[PDB]
Design a protein around this nucleic acid. Structure first.
Length: 73
RNA sequence: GUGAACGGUGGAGCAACACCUGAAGGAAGGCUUGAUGAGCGUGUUCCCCGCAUACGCGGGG
């Protein structure tokens, strides 16, 4: 669908020292959703890749999510 | 699995001490509470104004 997501925030945030990836945020949200459904006793690494996101495959393994790091205006 | 997750800007501290708003400055100078109003003349049909609508009422000099 090739979409762009923007976020405005009332409180200021910590300026991220390294890249604040969208797939990281979506993975943490999916982990929180899985904790909401399947209880707190879950492996977070089972569901942190269960994202509404396509995956880019490098020529030698090394798949990444199709998200990007959050740019700041 | 948001390079995350976890993390108290805290504890103590006198604004205060001294310091006269007031020294001098005229409410004065002129001025009837007594005046005014409270008593003394005309001797009989004649001009104007309204209501009417003339049978007379009212007023006026």
């Amino acid at each position: 669908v090739n979409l762009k997501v923007t976020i405005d925030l009332s409180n200021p945030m910590m300026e991220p020292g390294d890249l604040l990836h969208l797939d990281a945020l979506l993975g943490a949200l999916r982990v929180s959703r899985a904790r909401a459904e399947h209880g707190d006793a879950i492996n977070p690494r089972d569901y942190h890749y269960d994202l509404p996101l396509e995956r880019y495959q490098a020529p030698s393994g090394d798949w990444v999510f199709k998200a990007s790091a959050f740019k700041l205006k």
